């Protein structure tokens, strides 16, 4: 149905996302159990990790387009990522390595992430009809890899330990690299312009130097979240000032603020919603016992099933509004399950969490899939920088929000934790409903401005 390099990119993306979500699914628990962090420390440190992972995506598109070439930067990113995963596995021997290892994952992700999609775009003549379907299958590829990793990585870490789990993340990157190298012949005439000139060793060294520097800066920021906070605060106020100085951009600003709210909520899946499943949900569904950390896999699960359907099925601001209402309902459902449908021992049915994640995933499919695509319709490089900065800030904010659900390590009674989760999730849901209503009200004016 698709060009041959499509299947190469599909499977490279699958395996890279498998490695990443293998880490993400277990990381907060790793912080708590293996490093002895309180849940509060673990949640804010995960927020910092996620902020850096997301904010650095801005680098890899520039490196691939203008310095080294798309295909070269895919290779370099994959290698840095694999090194980061094996370094994380080594951190169990050398605990002091952990932050450096996570910084290496962040920087590796920054170099890699934008480039497979860029490559995929060049596999099709410019107005080919199959592009939309190919990109929906690409999103599904991301979420199949994520589904496998979030399902299996907690099981693997429980049965064989974290070193094995992280080394298997690394192995997934190695096999993404092997499948690329084996299929290299399929993309010989596909690439950005630097891909077809000899590699500049000057630029390569600049990229390696900057990467190493960034790995250390990331390690430091994740170790000292209280200054990552102020860094992103002052960067945010400053870039806001310079955005206001320099009206299709104003709609881009309001859509950016809505995206920030979405990412604050999305950040709850590996933290507060993860420990909510651990502490206050039954760990058995359809008669099978499961690791509750695996409940995170319900997000890619629902995306995989729902992306074709919603591909089969207003315009920009209304789709954003719809997604925000879906996200609101995910958190109101969590609150309601805890407030009214819990057992006498304080435990709720996992079907409520299945529904929570359905709502959240539909919100994702309306917002984040279709965000910078028609931010690119309203717009430049400066707004991309601001986009990645503000969404990184959203992940830091999300770690902070998650800390309101943190449970001290001595608490053992689910009836003590349940009202904490229900209060926080209910307030998240009410605030997000309010935001969705103001979004609805602005849809007509926004839609005029897009004209």
């Amino acid at each position: 149905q698709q060009p041959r390099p499509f299947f190469m990119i599909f499977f490279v993306e699958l395996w890279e996302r498998f490695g990443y979500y293998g880490v993400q699914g277990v990381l907060a628990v790793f912080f708590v159990k293996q490093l002895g962090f309180s849940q509060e420390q673990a949640f804010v440190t995960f927020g910092a990790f996620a902020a850096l992972v997301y904010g650095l995506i801005s680098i890899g598109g520039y490196v691939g387009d203008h310095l080294l070439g798309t295909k070269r930067t895919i290779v370099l990113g994959a290698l840095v990522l694999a090194i980061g995963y094996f370094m994380t596995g080594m951190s169990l021997l050398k605990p002091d390595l952990i932050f450096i290892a996570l910084g290496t994952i962040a920087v590796g992700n920054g170099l890699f992430k934008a480039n497979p999609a860029s490559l995929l775009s060049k596999c099709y003549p410019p107005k080919d009809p199959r592009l939309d379907g190919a990109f929906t299958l690409f999103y599904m590829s991301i979420n199949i890899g994520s589904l496998i990793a979030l399902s299996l990585a907690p099981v693997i870490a429980d049965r064989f330990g974290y070193s094995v789990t992280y080394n298997l993340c690394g192995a997934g990157l190695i096999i993404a690299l092997l499948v690329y190298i084996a299929c290299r012949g399929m993309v010989k005439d596909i690439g950005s312009e630097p891909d077809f000139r000899p590699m500049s060793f000057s630029k390569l060294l600049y990229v390696l130097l900057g990467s190493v520097v960034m790995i250390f800066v990331c390690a430091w920021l994740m170790h000292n979240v209280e200054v990552a906070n102020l860094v992103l605060i002052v960067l945010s106020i400053v870039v806001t000032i310079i955005f206001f100085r320099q009206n299709k951009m104003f709609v881009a600003f309001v859509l950016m603020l809505e995206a920030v709210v979405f990412y604050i909520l999305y950040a709850q899946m590996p933290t507060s919603l993860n420990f909510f499943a651990i502490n206050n949900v039954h760990h058995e569904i359809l008669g099978f016992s499961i690791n509750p950390v695996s409940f995170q896999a319900l997000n890619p699960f629902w995306v995989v099933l729902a992306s074709p359907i919603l591909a089969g099925i207003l315009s920009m601001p209304m789709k954003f509004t719809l997604g925000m209402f879906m996200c609101s309902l995910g958190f109101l459902t969590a609150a309601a399950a805890g407030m009214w449908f819990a057992d006498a021992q304080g435990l709720t049915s996992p079907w409520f969490i299945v529904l929570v994640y359905l709502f959240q995933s539909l919100g994702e499919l309306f917002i984040s899939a279709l965000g910078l695509a028609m931010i690119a319709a309203l717009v430049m490089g400066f707004i991309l920088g601001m986009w990645f900065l503000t969404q990184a800030a959203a992940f830091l904010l999300g770690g902070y929000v998650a800390t309101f659900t943190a449970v001290p390590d001595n608490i053992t009674d689910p009836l003590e934790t349940l009202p904490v989760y229900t209060n926080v999730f209910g307030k998240i849901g009410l605030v997000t409903l309010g935001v969705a209503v103001v979004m609805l009200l602005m849809v007509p004016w926004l839609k005029r401005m897009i004209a």
Epitope: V29, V32, K33, D158, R159, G161, I278, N279, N280, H282, H283, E284, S289, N291, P292, V293, D343, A344, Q345, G346, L347, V407, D409, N410, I411, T412, D413, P414, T417
Partner: nanobody, 122 residues
Framework: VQLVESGGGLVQAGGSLRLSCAAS????????VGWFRQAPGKEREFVAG???????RYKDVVKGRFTVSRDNVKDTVYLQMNSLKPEDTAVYYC?????????????????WGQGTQVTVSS
């Protein structure tokens, strides 16, 4: 995923016994381990437990007499039962639930030992 209990038996009132729970494939380290007991003609009841991060929970009638503790090197959880009384006679079970919570009812736990008879004679 499967727990092996050891250490039951027969003891006179005022004596002591120690139960131990060990797991096989999964590391017990990630699990809250609760001890339940079922006396003749009654339901399983929570007795005592330890969560994955050293938090403790006890039934009222065993406080000051039973101590739950954990050896994370040997991957074992222990129930030390002192000042035993005839009405502590029961089949004792260990149960394991992933995480930090010790729910009071058997349905909160997925993994179960087979049960060890504890008898306390007057």
């Amino acid at each position: 995923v499967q727990l092996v209990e050891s250490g039951g038996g027969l003891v006179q009132a005022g004596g002591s016994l120690r139960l131990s729970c060990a797991a096989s494939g999964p590391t017990l380290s990630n699990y809250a381990v609760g001890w339940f007991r079922q006396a003749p003609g009654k339901e399983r009841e929570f007795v005592a437990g330890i969560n994955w991060s050293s938090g403790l929970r006890y039934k009222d009638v065993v406080k000051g007499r039973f101590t739950v503790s954990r050896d994370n090197v040997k991957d074992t959880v222990y129930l030390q039962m002192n000042s035993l009384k005839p009405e502590d006679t029961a089949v004792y079970y260990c149960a394991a639930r992933f995480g930090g919570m010790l729910p009071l009812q058997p349905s909160g736990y997925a993994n179960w030992g087979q049960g060890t008879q504890v008898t306390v004679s007057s």
